Amino acid sequence: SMKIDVVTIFPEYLQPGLVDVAVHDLRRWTHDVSVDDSPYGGGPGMVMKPTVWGDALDEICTSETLLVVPTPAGYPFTQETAWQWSTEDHLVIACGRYEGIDQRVADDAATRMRVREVSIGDYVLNGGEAAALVIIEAVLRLVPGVSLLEGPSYTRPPSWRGMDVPPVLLSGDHAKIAAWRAEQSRQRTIERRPDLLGFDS
Amino acid sequence: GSMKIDVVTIFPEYLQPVRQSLPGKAIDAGLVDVAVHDLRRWTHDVHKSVDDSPYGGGPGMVMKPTVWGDALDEICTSETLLVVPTPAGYPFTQETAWQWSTEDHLVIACGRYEGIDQRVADDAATRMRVREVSIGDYVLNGGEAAALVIIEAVLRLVPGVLGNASLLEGPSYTRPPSWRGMDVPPVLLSGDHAKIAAWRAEQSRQRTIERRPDLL
């Protein structure tokens, strides 16, 4: 059983019994009627003010909440992270936009609850929303009650456009197939992700 | 400058957010067009089957090459860059995003179940450029979330399309100068801009050492 609350200024993006997922429009906690301002010390782009975030998260979080903050400067979100989070009761995902969220939101929250700044990969997005969907998919499929690269998979027909299924897969020989697949996985891994086997990227 | 993106999926609804993210101005200026196609349009049977049991046995199902073959034959040309999300792909990185941002036609083939019969990509690669890629070291249910990430990372590099304008970036601060007892670091208000740049550099170095020591 898990509850996930996503907090965003772009709730429209997210519209698509063991688990519930709620999307909250951060603008509902605004004081006047602008969440962003210019960065201290200068620099391009705008920064989300901590004030609106503080009120929102106050209402939504408890001290047992795991606060997840997507950021391109975060710790790596990996399958190990996903296993770790799959047994949590309550995740709140704070989605930023502009050039991100004032650092004091995460620093303050970390005095009241567990906080995790994470990145889903080494590319730049426009905000936390797409990252939130990745994190949610990766975690929810591991919730109770739901190393190497995988080799190639095949199905019918056995011959297609003159291209044949590797004959070993039609042999019915379990041990030869397990061997052949173990081989394919290791060959794909060394070619595409040599770092996984301890070699230079 | 301008890009056509075709996405093929059995869940075209999952692609609603990319349409939600596209500004009307960029569409009307003909800078971008994103079409989403239901794979089942190309099925052959009354049950609209897209999957079948794996040769060699195993759990899960494999997506049928004949259905994918027809769909891609229709949508792709020899000038297409065919992108295939997969948990066994080459890493998709910012370098990848930069390279693809200058393409004229991207087609993203989103798999489900255990993935797509390998002959589909192998066949396609004999007449177009094909890229099997993974967006990170975690496991998803299919290619659709990866296509959202890929499309966003690529399109924000195409000038004027999404509306937007090595170490990890350090922390940022804005108003108010004091909040819940935490002050913005005084150096940022010192007006000494060489010292500010040095302070930011050192924050970046510390954060990188702590969060991503591999980058060093």
Ligand SMILES: N#Cc1c(-c2ccc3ccn(Cc4ccc(CN5CCCCC5)cc4)c3c2)n[nH]c1N
């Ligand atoms: N997870 C994850 C992510 C994200 C992600 C997550 C959350 C937010 C909230 C806002 N943005 C956009 C953004 C983009 C660039 C920069 C750095 N800039 C570089 C120099 C000029 C100024 C700042 C900051 C903020 C976000 C991006 N991107 N990539 C991932 N794997």
Ligand SMILES: N#Cc1c(-c2ccc3ccn(Cc4ccc(CN5CCCCC5)cc4)c3c2)n[nH]c1N
């Ligand atoms: N990009 C990207 C991705 C994807 C991604 C991309 C495309 C598809 C199409 C289907 N799936 C789901 C799936 C999940 C697991 C497995 C491995 N199996 C499980 C155990 C038995 C052996 C085989 C295969 C297929 C996809 C996942 N995941 N993570 C990324 N970074």
